[PDB]
Amino acid sequence: CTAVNFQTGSHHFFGRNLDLEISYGEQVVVTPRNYPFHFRQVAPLTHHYALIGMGIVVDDYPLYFDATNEKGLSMAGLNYPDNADYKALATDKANVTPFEFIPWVLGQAASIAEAKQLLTKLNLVKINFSDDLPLSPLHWLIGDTHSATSLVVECDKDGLHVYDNPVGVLTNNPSFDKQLFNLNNYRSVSPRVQENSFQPATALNDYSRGLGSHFLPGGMDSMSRFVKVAFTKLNAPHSATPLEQVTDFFHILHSVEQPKNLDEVAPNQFEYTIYSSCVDADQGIYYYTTYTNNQINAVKLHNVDLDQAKLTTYALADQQTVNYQN
Amino acid sequence: CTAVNFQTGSHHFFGRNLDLEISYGEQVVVTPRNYPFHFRQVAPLTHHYALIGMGIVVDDYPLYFDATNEKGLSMAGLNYPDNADYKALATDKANVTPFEFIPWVLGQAASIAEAKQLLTKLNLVKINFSDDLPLSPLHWLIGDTHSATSLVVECDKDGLHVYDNPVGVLTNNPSFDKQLFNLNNYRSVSPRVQENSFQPATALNDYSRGLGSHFLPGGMDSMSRFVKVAFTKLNAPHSATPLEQVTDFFHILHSVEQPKNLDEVAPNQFEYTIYSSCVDADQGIYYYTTYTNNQINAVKLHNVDLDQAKLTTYALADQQTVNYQN
Amino acid sequence: CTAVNFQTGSHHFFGRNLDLEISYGEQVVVTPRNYPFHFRQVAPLTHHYALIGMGIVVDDYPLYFDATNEKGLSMAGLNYPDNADYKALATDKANVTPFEFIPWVLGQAASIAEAKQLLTKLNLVKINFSDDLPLSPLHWLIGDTHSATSLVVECDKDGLHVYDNPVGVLTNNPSFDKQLFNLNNYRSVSPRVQENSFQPATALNDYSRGLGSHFLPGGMDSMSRFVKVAFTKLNAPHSATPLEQVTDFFHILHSVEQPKNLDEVAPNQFEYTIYSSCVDADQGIYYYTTYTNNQINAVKLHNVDLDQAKLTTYALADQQTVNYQN
Amino acid sequence: CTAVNFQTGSHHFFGRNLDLEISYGEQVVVTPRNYPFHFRQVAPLTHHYALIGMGIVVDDYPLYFDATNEKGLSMAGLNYPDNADYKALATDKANVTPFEFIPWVLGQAASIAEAKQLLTKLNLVKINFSDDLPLSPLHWLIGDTHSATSLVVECDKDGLHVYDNPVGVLTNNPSFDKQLFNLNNYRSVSPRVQENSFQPATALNDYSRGLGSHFLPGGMDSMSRFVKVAFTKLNAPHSATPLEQVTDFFHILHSVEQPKNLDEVAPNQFEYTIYSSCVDADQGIYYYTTYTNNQINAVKLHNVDLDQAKLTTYALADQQTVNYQN
Ligand SMILES: [Ca+2]
Ligand SMILES: [Ca+2]
Ligand SMILES: [Ca+2]
Ligand SMILES: [Ca+2]
């Protein structure tokens, strides 16, 4: 998985690749303001901000992979195997399950600054959604429309960690302190061909455009994708119009998509990028591609009656949709 | 630039990324059988195989970047700076300019076997199209629908070279013997997590899916893209229908697209993937995406009257085309 | 700097490269049992285990870079810039300066088990030896002759950390959790040529012996040296005699020596391996080479009267000493 | 194998690592001026320049791995598997066997310029020394005391190649055009920490000295050792005295020695650096270390009666020779 919080030209785009070996029946899910969220161990949110994101609906409950609220606050949950350590109930904390975490934050917080207030009280508790659907190990990226900031939330064996993330990207393991530190090793990677420091008197031929990034990683693994997406995001252009910025964002995410069949997780099982999302967080527009359809599709939050109480779901436009010009 | 010859399930797909710092006004150009091909130093081709490909029409003439003929033979010209060496007129040989080379081969030859016969009589002559447009340094990939074989044509200072290319990919510099040899260094890269050979008694954590490709290159440079596209192409799935295979092909080419602004070629100039093409060579369908529009577009060769004599051109659908689902 | 704890055939060898840009006048220093160790903030050690190691005698006091006591316990202090955080005096704890730390542990403890007991009461206090010589930022490797265990001691801003280190090597930054984790990325490196997993159907030439370690790091930086020295140490042979094992040990340390002038730390200043040491910890024999003399030199702890109270120092044999055979 | 031609301060040092899985009984062999060389297919050299180098003596004939003559011309033969292609007899060439090549050149040539005259006539012929001792596939590095030049001689399937080699190093496969070209990919490696070009606004910590060489190869394979030894040689210091320059040379060669047991060539067989040589080519002094003895040993050409006709051989000082200081 890869998530990116991208800010250009006063605009804010947030989204992710979902990389998995099997699809769970993903849909774009709009949760209106009056859908009642009845949490296991904290106070209910029966009126709250509307949400749009990708998820599945089980027992009429929206299980979000990622979402953005009507105020521009976004979250994505990304696989964090072995490191995630959910906790026992704590009598002096807000006890929230990992499947409730996105609705709990996004339903009531409008900014990263406000989300930080919730995070100071949070205890992520080890309660399964159902006996059929045990908890996935996750960590989260959070972005908003009010700062250049991103947060990374990692609940580890030693406790809850909340990191500032100015780079604005996240993948899978290792924990964020190790992941971010690794960028230090790539300081010499460049968009330009560097000076010959190997030995200036030795005739080294600048034989290919792009030689500046010769040591950039391109593997399917979490650390390689973190480095590559950081370089790609940090060197993105600053386009003039919102749709061009969306196009730029998709080029960032697709730079670290996992194609079939390059990441084998089990015999006859390959992890690949099921979908790539980009939310225009200012407008509430959820754009996405899928592995099977290259055309960008969009669902507009504000085309739904946000005062309803029922979920609205859209099946993904999953079939390759070609424009036949003659 | 990157070009790929991809065969799966009786079907043949051939296509390329065009990576440049500026667009030249590219269009899909269909040259029908009776468009007369005039050459600077050989007899004209007044009746020939029809061609479909991407190019520029300059005055009255189609200057192709890549093309496929009605018999399934494909060619793409890719940047080959400094290594390309075009020749003086040779008395005993067919003297063809690099800009006439695609029409000359594809107009006459129906297969790799026939193309090889033409290449034994070929001299690529240093003659500019005009004073305006001097010759570009190129090398070529050739594929067909009769073999799992690709050819690489490189006209170097020491003469013309024609290589067998079973891997079926090509980028830019260096020459193909050095480029193909470099794959030997990546033998240990894997779709699956390899056994711990560093020291089996040491507890090394398999902490990320995709760790098998941890050492795969991801840079924008020619050698990095060659390695990555080879690994991605050689590990592609075998899908059931031609449209799904086209989708797989685009995931191969997009694995090594060059995003803005990661490859700086000069101050304020960045080489990026202008378009990516995929030709179904058995049906003559030219599919493409562009940097600015993610939807796949298609032009069908056989929707044109191939007995005409005039060119048929299609402007690229280059505006981002979103499917709004609500 | 690099330190290694190496065990083979019932024997224990411990030693280090000292990498600095300038030499400080290092000598082999034997501190006998009755040299009184005076400390700034704890009781003196008037009778203690004897020590042998490399250091500087400043006024009357031995400042050790590394040492081994008469019971087989060894310690080395290695540069740990920016991460080291020495502490204010703590009322409940043994307040020991970083320059007293080696005498404090090795003077009292005979094994890792006993050293661990001392570490539970330790506070490394920020007290300079003098205004002339301010404290250096360090972390420590500890080994013994009773286990195949090494300890890493790192006093960071968030407190004192003591890690188990089965691999038995240490360099400089980053902290040991990040450093040890990095070995996971090198699981596929091998002493032998690996199977072709890039694509088995593609003819990849096994063109060089040693291709199994094609991705092993060779740079002068701390993380590169950690990976290379780990691979080299973990794949060392098991030789029959102690002197042959010493030879094997020096090949391990020299695998990551820093030659002039490959590591520039400032204009006209290059960090290089001043000396490499190997202590036979069971016999108390301190072997070393220097950058300027390739012959191994040795000082035997037990050739000194260990009941004395005065220091015994040996100047390094640092002039290149050639055996002329004719 | 690795060979280096090193020039500093008006002095010339030439030498090599011999990397093999088994020792052949190597000795330092001095061939005096009147030892008769009776060649298979060219005129005899019964009076010629004296030679010193490492070799074996079989049937009273010196089979040199490497050698230097009394005029300062040096050659080393290094393993070149599969690529070496020795030829049939040629009636218009000087037909010289690969085992005669070093005596044939060094016996009669005093400079690279003179050796070039011999190379224009050379045909390396496929004649075994004996049925017991078939030819090894080799390529050669040549240096002298009159230029900064080195030559590389490679007899390939397509013919004899003689390359200029200003870098002055050589290992094993691939052929020299591919080997030297590979240095282009390492232009950004540096003795100093490079500017942060990954993204200047992103806080990348310069956390380790030596980070400039983070991407330098350290593997046991031929291409890795070529890059590492080139960087190490090209960044060597310029020491003031001959013996210091010899010490510097050994640090260059030892930077790419192959330790046991990191290069497995067959079950229970590991290729390792049997010896490392350094010839002061101006003085005729053959210095060497061995895997088993770290002390430098030396044989002086001019301590032998060079007007004799019998070979003089010295067994290597192979046992670890320690200087016990107390
Ligand atoms: Ca609120
Ligand atoms: Ca941690
Ligand atoms: Ca002569
Ligand atoms: Ca060749």
Residue numbers in the entry:
A (entry chain B), B (entry chain A), C (entry chain A), D (entry chain B): 2 to 327
Paper's wording?
Bile salt hydrolases (BSHs) comprise a diverse family of microbial enzymes that catalyse critical BA transformation. Primary conjugated BAs synthesized in the liver, such as the tauro- and glycoconjugates of cholic acid (TCA, GCA), are deconjugated by BSHs to generate cholic acid (CA) (BA names and abbreviations are summarized in Supplementary Fig. 1). We found that Lactobacillaceae BSHs display a clear bias for either glycine or taurine-conjugated BAs. Notably, each monomer contains a loop that swaps into the active site of a neighbouring monomer within the tetramer and places amino acids proximal to the catalytic residues.
